Design an enzyme around this catalytic site. Structure first.
Site, short mmCIF file in Angstrom:
data_model
loop_
_atom_site.label_atom_id
_atom_site.label_comp_id
_atom_site.label_asym_id
_atom_site.label_seq_id
_atom_site.Cartn_x
_atom_site.Cartn_y
_atom_site.Cartn_z
N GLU A 35 0.82 -1.22 0.00
CA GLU A 35 0.00 0.00 0.00
C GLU A 35 0.84 1.26 0.00
O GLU A 35 0.65 2.18 -0.81
CB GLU A 35 -0.94 0.11 1.24
N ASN A 46 -6.95 10.47 -5.79
CA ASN A 46 -7.69 9.60 -6.70
C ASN A 46 -8.58 10.39 -7.63
O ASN A 46 -8.64 11.62 -7.57
CB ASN A 46 -8.61 8.63 -5.96
N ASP A 48 -12.30 10.30 -8.13
CA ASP A 48 -13.44 11.10 -7.74
C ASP A 48 -13.08 11.95 -6.55
O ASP A 48 -13.85 12.05 -5.60
CB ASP A 48 -14.71 10.25 -7.40
N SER A 50 -11.24 11.60 -3.90
CA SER A 50 -10.85 11.12 -2.58
C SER A 50 -9.32 10.97 -2.56
O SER A 50 -8.68 11.02 -3.61
CB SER A 50 -11.54 9.81 -2.32
N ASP A 52 -6.09 8.63 -0.51
CA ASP A 52 -5.77 7.57 0.43
C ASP A 52 -4.58 8.13 1.20
O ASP A 52 -3.67 8.67 0.56
CB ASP A 52 -5.36 6.28 -0.35
N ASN A 59 -9.00 5.44 2.85
CA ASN A 59 -9.65 6.35 1.88
C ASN A 59 -10.50 7.44 2.49
O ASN A 59 -11.30 7.13 3.37
CB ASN A 59 -10.54 5.55 0.94
#
Length: 129
Positions: A35, A46, A48, A50, A52, A59
């Protein structure tokens, strides 16, 4: 902060993650490798809107509030910046909430793609724990 394999394993063990909801420690160390590559400050912005955050790339659409994610929820009841600290606690506490709600460790795509079905014991090799 970047952690070494055994240093993170040890800290995750201290935080009660070994066999948490049936997942042995090797799973959690494997998931943090793929990760974030053990980096507490990793962020991945990201599509849309968001992002992480942190060692376990949690998220912002569902789990933490960063003030700019389009249809966001704050289920772990934290600012997303708490997930970017050198100490792992807010990330492990929110991760325990994720595994108890959304289908175990399948919530992490890197675990589901790179760790699931392999022998995760290898990730604790040489760490005296």
């Amino acid at each position: 902060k970047v952690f070494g394999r055994c240093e993170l394993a040890a800290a995750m063990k201290r935080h009660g993650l070994d066999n948490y909801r049936g997942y042995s420690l090797g799973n959690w160390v494997c998931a943090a490798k793929f990760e974030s590559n053990f980096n507490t400050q990793a962020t991945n912005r990201n599509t849309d809107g968001s992002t992480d955050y942190g060692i376990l790339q949690i998220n912002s659409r569902w789990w933490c509030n960063d003030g700019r994610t389009p249809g966001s929820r704050n289920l772990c009841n934290i600012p997303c910046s708490a997930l970017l600290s050198s100490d792992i606690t807010a990330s492990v506490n929110c991760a325990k909430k994720i595994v108890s709600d959304g289908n175990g460790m399948n919530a992490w795509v890197a675990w589901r793609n790179r760790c699931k079905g392999t022998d995760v014991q290898a990730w604790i090799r040489g760490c005296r724990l």
